[model samples]
Target chain A: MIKVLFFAQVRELVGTDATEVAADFPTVEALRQHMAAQSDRWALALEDGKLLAAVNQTLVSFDHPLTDGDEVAFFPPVTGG
Target chain B: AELSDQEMLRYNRQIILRGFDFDGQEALKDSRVLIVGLGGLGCAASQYLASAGVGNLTLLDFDTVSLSNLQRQTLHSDATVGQPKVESARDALTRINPHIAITPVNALLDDAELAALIAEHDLVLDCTDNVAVRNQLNAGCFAAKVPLVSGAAIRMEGQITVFTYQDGEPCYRCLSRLFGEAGVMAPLIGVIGSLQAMEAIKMLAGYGKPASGKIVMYDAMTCQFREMKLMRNPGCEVCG
Candidate 1:
């Protein structure tokens, strides 16, 4: 299973801090699709394209791949300095 | 003019420190500092400055306190929701230390404003969240030959540094060379605000050395604080 965390506005909108997702997907894109399919809130949070995803706690683009048990996070583009 | 009895008690901790005493406190009291933003970093920095007996504080912000800001913008409370952030910050600072003078400028900082503001202040704190503003502040400080304390925070991490125009130290543009023209704001805000506050306090109190010629980065997730020496760039467009 893969762990997914949410932060800031993404956490606020998603209504949950973290969750374990079945790691059936191999790529980050597929994982995002699976997440979007999980619930309407996830769909809404991922819809606008403002939300960014991180792999293993480091910021990465969407095309980055995912492995089983890896941690993933979804959040908005940075606004702080 | 000497510090009164009440002032001594209030600043007793600082007065006893080496290289700092009533004289340093007086210098702080006589000095003016201009803060460029009232966001997460600025809010925390201003709070410490107020409590530390900084003489004059000039705050510039065109934004207001939104409900979303309460998590890390410690200067504002629930009662201050929907108010201009600078107003709320000024009120909060005055409540903490009424002796300090505060000037709030409710406008975006432009070239002219920055130039004028830098001229009046003994030092400038670049607490802005935007890269463009930071660059502008650096250029202005350099042009005016003022000292600048720059701090930034994002999700799970923060950085602090000091730059001065009189010295041959690296400017903000030199340290942030990798940061291209398209300056992107951090995705998360509060993660770095508190750290920014600490840096500001250290700078104001003249306590431990300020982060000059070095960039201190804080990683919250790992709880590690690391420092890296920053070299001055001769090709820096802002302050080479």
Candidate 2:
């Protein structure tokens, strides 16, 4: 399973902090595509390209590989003081 | 006042730091600093500044300590769970360095308040957790020509930089053109607040060179630190 988390504005928009999906994807990009297809909000959120992702708690690009039980998060770039 | 026998023992290690001695410690005791926030980064910065024997510290924060803050906001404990952040931080700082004076301002800084605060301090530490507040601080510091040190941490990533209108260096807004995007809050908060504290010490003690005109990025996962040169925006509204 792949665990995904949302934070701040992204979490508010997604209305869920985290969720787990069966890990059938091979790369972060494929997982993002799968997540975007899961719901209308995810589709819009992922479409805008405003959110950043971290795989296994490390910031990673879309092409970064993923495996079972990896944790990913989609958050807007941090701008905190 | 001369360092009492007890003070000598208490600050013995600090007095031994290469450029810092009793005279430098006295300077710290005579100087006042305004710190803008008491969140993750602020919490650590305040502790170190206090431990360094900064004469006077003014902490500004309008929020209350929350359970979520435990990961990095180390000053507070279970006893302070619901207390006002500034009050709790004040208590903690006083306990850490009772000889110094601590003033807790439990309100968001406004234009007028910031103007007055910036004018009175020799240095400012922008430990705020939000970009908007940092922008305001940058504008105020620029107008007042004060030295300001800024830092931020989210998840495992952190960055720190110094800005001073005195040196004609770019202010925070000037370096990060996408100032608006830089302030957006992150979903994950990390415990690198201690690093921010260390930066504040370096800035205050005048030991190492200040990290100005460059953003020092730290990737905790890789244990790597990178410095990126920053440019001043010709059209920056705050500082050009």
Highest DockQ model number: 1
True-vs-predicted CA distance for residue B23, candidate 1, Å: 1.0
Candidate with the greatest TM-score versus the true structure: 2
Off by over 4 Å in 1: A1-79, B181-208
- Error in Å for residue B1 of model 1: 5.2
**Lowest lDDT 10-residue stretch of candidate 1 chain B:** B179-188
The lDDT of model 1 is 0.73
What would the per-residue lDDT of candidate 2 be over residues B35-90, giving only the tens digit for each residue?
88888778777887888788899988899998877756788888999998999999
| lDDT, each prediction | 0.73, 0.73
lDDT of 1 by residue, A9-80 (tens): 466667887889888878777877777777888787665355556577554556668889898876554334
DockQ of each: 0.14, 0.12
For model 2, the superposed segments whose C-alpha errors exceed 4 Å read: A1-77, B179-192
Per-residue lDDT over B66-97 for candidate 1, one digit per residue giving the tens place of the 0 to 100 score: 87777778788899998888999999889989
